[PDB]
Amino acid sequence: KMTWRTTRTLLQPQKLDFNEFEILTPLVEGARIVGLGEGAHFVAEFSLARASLIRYLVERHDFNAIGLECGAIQASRLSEYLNSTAGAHELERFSDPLTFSLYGSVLIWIKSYLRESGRKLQLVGIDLPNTLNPRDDLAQLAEIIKVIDHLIKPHVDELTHLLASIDGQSAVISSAKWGEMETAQQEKAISGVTRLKLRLASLAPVLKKHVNSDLFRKASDRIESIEYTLETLRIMRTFFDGTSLEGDTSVRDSYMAGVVDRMVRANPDVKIILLAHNNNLQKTPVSFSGELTAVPMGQHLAEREEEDYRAIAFTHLGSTVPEMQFPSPGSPLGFSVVTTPADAIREDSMEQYIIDACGTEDSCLTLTDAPMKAKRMRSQSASVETNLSEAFDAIVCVPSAGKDGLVD
């Protein structure tokens, strides 16, 4: 049998009992990276649970950064939203549609939580621009290299003209405008980025020596972002083209793995809460039917020799779940979020053990530290099949998954 604990206050950030969460201190001990999952995007109970566990990890375990599925320039605008107590400091002016929908309630809660608690937290973007629009990365790169390697400002500029066509506000719309370029131009862009990355890597010893050592670090981060953005656009154009080779979806997660890895050693004092989907936080291959859909970011991260990565998945016992529907014409993001039947709970489901251990009407929290018949877990409206004792450290379960209010 397992270690479980009913947590009644879990869905109430304001009125929280931290003793309910003492179950988590064994695995939060000597961890520097902990992922707060979500069985599906856009779920209100999952934002509530995320805020409560954020407040727990912060106030009892000194976590000082939050990782988001947004590019690092998106994240720096969110940190402007956070610290600004100025007039009309609304989130709609420091976020984009998809960021707003994925993270809105959490971000509003966090802004008001740090203004009411004096604590300060470091927002970090661990993802590509979640719009897959490379313009910001390209423009900031051009501004850095004009100082540290002006001789290849032309190429950068031409690159941004070559990619100016990629202005979507979602992954799918920029994907569609990427499939609209003829392939000679796609290849021109990809090869030009690889050439840039190699010149910069090779000149590093002298480019570090101009202005500040950190401008080269930022230029390399921007180039990494762009390279993986273009390769995600390609991989996705082939997903809706039937040329999608098994496993390609691992690429974006690998980027995020790298981004987390490279940052945590660089600032060895950072304890980072990660807000990312269950499939990204997972530590084993993501498989819905036995195929290898992706190596998740967390599998890479579990290979960190320091063994200080923990993954806490979030799931629910509800009958419905918000689900993304493609396409949704006219919708700002090229998809819509519709209430759809969750995947059925079966005898090999984590959720069926949750029913048979905690009940159906109080949120639950358990360790995976025990052999178990549970092979499966809800993800979006489908399910993943995996060893759940090695895919996640913990499992938070809530009775139901309702659409978070502010997504539209």
**What range does the domain containing 179 cover?**
135-239
Structural domain contains residue 116: yes
* 248 torsion bin: left (phi>0), alpha (psi -120 to 50), beta (else): alpha
Number of domains in the chain: 2
Q: Which resolution in angstroms does this entry have?
A: 2.4
For 229, other C-beta atoms within 10 Å of its C-beta total 27
Same domain for 277 and 190: no
Written in H, E and C, the secondary structure of the chain is CCCEEECCHHHCCCCCCHHHHHHHHHHHCCCCEEEECCCCCCEHHHHHHHHHHHHHHHHHHCCCEEEECCCHHHHHHHHHHHHCCCCCCCHHHCCCHHHHHHHHHHHHHHHHHHHHHCCCCEEEECCCCCCCCCHHHHHHHHHHHHHHCHHHHHHHHHHHHHCCCCCCCCHHHHHHHHCCCCHHHHHHHHHHHHHHHHHHHHHHHHHCCCCCHHHHHHHHHHHHHHHHHHHHHHHHHHHCCCCCCCCCCHHHHHHHHHHHHHHHHHCCCCCEEEECCHHHHCCCCECCCCCCCECCHHHHHHCCCCCCEEEEEEEECCCEEEEEECCCCCCCCCCEEEEEECCCCCCCEHHHHHHHHHCCCCCEEEECCCCCCCCEEEECCEEEECCHHHHCCEEEEECCCCECCCCC
Compute φ and ψ for 165, nearest 5 degrees.
-65, -10
Structural domain contains residue 265: no
Count the residues in the chain.
Answer: 408
Residue 2: beta bridge partners? none
Rounded distance between C-alpha atoms, residue 306 and residue 289, angstroms:
32
Rounded distance between C-alpha atoms, residue 206 and residue 319, angstroms:
59
Rounded distance between C-alpha atoms, residue 370 and residue 378, angstroms:
20
Same domain for 190 and 120: no
Same domain for 286 and 226: no
Same domain for 117 and 14: yes
Rounded distance between C-alpha atoms, residue 221 and residue 225, angstroms:
6
Tokens found for residue 327: 């396409």
User: Do residues 12 and 52 touch, judged by C-beta distance below 8 A?
Assistant: yes
* Token pair 């251990």: residue: 357
Same domain for 361 and 301: yes
Euclidean distance between the first and the last CA atom of the chain, given in angstroms as a whole number: 42
Rounded distance between C-alpha atoms, residue 367 and residue 291, angstroms:
27
CA dihedral angle for residue 393, residue 51, residue 46, residue 360, rounded to 10 degrees: 80
Q: Which of 24, 25, 34 is nearest to 264 (CA)?
A: 34
Structural domain contains residue 403: no
Residue 181 makes CB contacts below 8 A (sequence gap 6+) with: 165
129 alpha-carbon distance from chain centroid: 11
Question: How was it solved?
Answer: X-ray
Structural domain contains residue 70: yes
For 359, other C-beta atoms within 10 Å of its C-beta total 13
Structural domain contains residue 59: yes
User: Do residues 135 and 167 touch, judged by C-beta distance below 8 A?
Assistant: yes
Rounded distance between C-alpha atoms, residue 61 and residue 371, angstroms:
28
Rounded distance between C-alpha atoms, residue 394 and residue 27, angstroms:
9
Residue 365: beta bridge partners? 5, 396
Most distant CA pair in the chain: distance in Å? 66
For 143, other C-beta atoms within 10 Å of its C-beta total 15
Same domain for 328 and 305: yes
Rounded distance between C-alpha atoms, residue 398 and residue 46, angstroms:
8
Same domain for 84 and 147: no
* Token pair 């008001």: residue: 112
Rounded distance between C-alpha atoms, residue 206 and residue 204, angstroms:
6
C-alpha to C-alpha distances, 318 to 190, 299, 321, nearest whole angstrom: 44, 28, 7
Same domain for 199 and 176: yes
Rounded distance between C-alpha atoms, residue 120 and residue 114, angstroms:
6
Structural domain contains residue 280: yes
Written in H, E and C, the secondary structure of 277-311 is CHHHHCCCCECCCCCCCECCHHHHHHCCCCCCEEE
Structural domain contains residue 47: yes
User: Do residues 273 and 66 touch, judged by C-beta distance below 8 A?
Assistant: yes
The last residue of a domain, from among 190, 224, 239: 239
Same domain for 139 and 116: no
Same domain for 146 and 201: yes
Compute φ and ψ for 395, nearest 5 degrees.
-135, 120
The last residue of a domain, from among 218, 239, 260: 239
Rounded distance between C-alpha atoms, residue 234 and residue 191, angstroms:
13
Same domain for 307 and 390: yes
Residue 51 maps to which CATH number?
3.40.1660.10
Rounded distance between C-alpha atoms, residue 46 and residue 214, angstroms:
37
Angle ∠(245,249,255) on CA atoms, nearest 5: 130
